[PDB]
Every structure is written in C-alpha cells, then in structure tokens.
C-alpha cells in the first residue's frame, strides 16, 4: 500500500525520463536520465547525497526491477518516483542514483494530493 511505499522510500519526486541509460547485468535493471520537476520528500537527501546534473537532473536506476510492478519507463514518460539513494554495496555501478524502491505512479492531482498527505502524515511526529 502506499503508506508503506512512502514509509520505504526516502525520497519521492516528480519529473519526466530524458534518457534510457546502462543495463545492471549482474540485477537485471536499466537506469535513467530523469529531469526532477518537484520533490514531494526528501529533497534534503537529494541536495546532500546526490550531485545534481544541470540543476535538476537525476540518473534512477532499479528499473526493469522484476519485484516491482510497474518498472519500465520510455523518453517523455513522467512519473512520481519512489527511490532511495544507492547503498555503497550498490558502488560503483549505481553510485550518484536514486534506486527504485516500488511502482512508479502517474503525475495526476489525485496521486500527487495522495503522496503528499502520506508524506506530510508521516512527517507529522511532533504535530
């Protein structure tokens, strides 16, 4: 369910694939160029673990991922993206990427209403 796909992933951003990048053969995923159009959670993670390129552009791998359902993008496609920054055991093949966490989902006003309370719900300890 979503509470748990936001409670497992990090970070939660918006944007549209640019470019299909590099086969991980030895896990079977493809990576991505995607431009960030805005974060719904932690862009902090983001701004300190991930160089940027130009500014708002990401590379996210974990696609194909053969355990999460919808996991295959094309250029143009946009998406809201549950990722978590590669683990070092994930280096060098996918350092500087935001890995998949689950299913990518379509840029509406009711996924995008629907992520930002789970976000926003979560976020409220001290409220």
Known sequence: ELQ?????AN???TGTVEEIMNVDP???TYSCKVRVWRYLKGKDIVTH???LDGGNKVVIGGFGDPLI????????????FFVNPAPQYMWPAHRNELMLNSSLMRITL???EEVEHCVEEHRKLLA
Not at 71 to 79: I, K, P, Y
């Open 49 to 51: 673990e991930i160089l």
């Open 4 to 8: 748990r796909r936001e409670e497992e």
């Open 26 to 28: 030895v896990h079977h």
């Open 69 to 80: 359902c919808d996991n295959q993008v094309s250029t143009g496609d946009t998406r809201i």
């Open 110 to 112: 009711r996924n995008l």
């Open 11 to 13: 970070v939660v951003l």
